[PDB]
């Protein structure tokens, strides 16, 4: 009855919110595993000491000695059973395959979450999937593995484990879809709401003078760096459009993106009769994270506040400006092309976001980086057809090298 969790990326935004839930409901949740990359070992050490995982994976093996030290400090305050450390590229896979856990919280960023996510599902474990990049890149493989071309989340296949959404928009849609019978599925239209990010209503030339600083101040949501930057480019919504296609089995024509700055409506579905079902809330990821862990039950928490529309003011809905923010067009083009185009788009974007965060390239060059890569992938072969997992790996790599080699125009 307890749910044993393995949290990947425990030190990030999603990971910490997950453990906040585990801490408030210790009778329900037990932590068997934590994984982190090593950039914040002080927090990993305090997480290990608090939750006493049996297994810990460390993405950077160079910092085993520092982790051991910080654990040794915590042991002097209070003794706890030392975990077995897992390392290397095979470490994440072994952790995901441990028996003795029910749910894998996949909150690693990027393509490095794909495989652990895959082997947990195959190992019969449910996956609360935050890592959108997995489904963007390896959508077909998830669809084949879960043996569905429709709704991948849930068990509405009415052995593999269940896949449940953590992202705010996919959670809203998934909650709104609860109770929609098969006769009304797929929905007519999927409405994904985007805050529009901090540069809403700015010209493309106003975006030349934009600092990393300004890009990292998000109006409605407090999150990681990559996702916050992607909301400023609107490549975050672009990625969610492709994720939705594979997750809900909807054509790209059925998928609409509305700029809703107040971020009150988290996303919606339109049904055959013209009824729209929308899920509303405050911008806190503990609701969706918790729903992925409790589905179909909903936990009542001290932070479980709820939105007051009278107080909130007024709700605005607008079309995105596809000229200024070309990343959204790039996602739609990539999705319609199919094959490994989604993968190349994601990798090119990951690289451009990192280069933008290391001050090597500027903001406007993120879109031009992604455009450059995909122009070339079009010129190279287009056989697509079947999408092998290794085919995704090869394109991801190729795209990363091309994204790094891109030199901004002079
Ligand atoms: N509000 C949200 O944040 C939100 C909402 C919806 C979806 N998502 C999606 O979920 C993913 C996580 O986003 P986030 O904001 O939580 O990212 P983040 O805050 O930057 O967290 C990154 C996590 O991944 C760990 N990590 C990095 N490299 C690793 C590696 N090689 N091996 C093991 N762990 C590694 C990191 O450890 P260290 O930092 O210690 O190195 C850290 O714990 C993203 O795809 C995001 O698009 C996020
Ligand atoms: O998990 C929450 N999001 O992905 C949405 C916040 C980013 P947006 O500006 O694209 O709505
Ligand atoms: Cl289905
Ligand atoms: Mg996280
Ligand atoms: Mg434990
Ligand atoms: Mg096609």
Author numbering: 25 to 182, 221 to 472
Q: What did the publication describing this PDB structure actually write?
A:
In this study, we present the first crystal structure of T. gondii DXR (TgDXR) in a tertiary complex with the inhibitor fosmidomycin and the cofactor NADPH in dimeric conformation at 2.5 Å resolution revealing the inhibitor binding mode. The asymmetric unit contains one homodimer. NADPH is bound to the Rossmann fold by interactions typically observed, while the pyrophosphate moiety interacts with the consensus sequence GGGNGA, establishing further interactions with the co-substrate NADPH which is bound at the identical position as found in other DXR proteins. The binding of the adenine and pentose phosphate moieties of NADPH is identical to that observed in the structure of the E. coli DXR, in contrast, the nicotinamide ring of NADPH is ordered in this fosmidomycin complex. Within the solvent-shielded cavity that is formed upon closure of the ‘lid’ residues 281–285 the inhibitor backbone lies parallel to the β-indole of Trp283 at a distance of ∼4 Å. The hydroxamic acid moiety of the inhibitor binds to the side-chain of Glu231. The sidechain of Glu231 itself is stabilized and positioned via interaction with Lys299. Fosmidomycin further interacts with the sidechains of Asn298 and His280. The sidechain of Glu302 also points towards the fosmidomycin, however the distance is roughly 4 Å indicating a very weak interaction or maybe this interaction is water mediated which cannot be conclusively modelled at this resolution. Not surprisingly, also the binding site for fosmidomycin at TgDXR consists of the same amino acids as seen in the structure of the EcDXR, indicating that the domain of TgDXR is similar to the EcDXR domain. The distance of the hydroxymate region of fosmidomycin to NADPH is 4.4 Å, which is too large for conversion (indicated by the yellow line in Figure 4C).
The 1-Deoxy-d-xylulose 5-phosphate reductoisomerase (DXR, IspC, EC 1.1.1.267), the second and rate-limiting enzyme in the MEP pathway, catalyzes the isomerization and the reduction of 1-Deoxy-d-xylulose 5-phosphate (DXP) into MEP. The catalysis occurs with dependency of a metallic dication (Mg2+) and NADPH as cofactors. TgDXR is composed of three domains: an N-terminal NADPH-binding domain, a connective domain and a C-terminal α-helical domain. These are arranged in a V shape, where the N-terminal and C-terminal domains form the two arms and the central domain lies at the vertex.
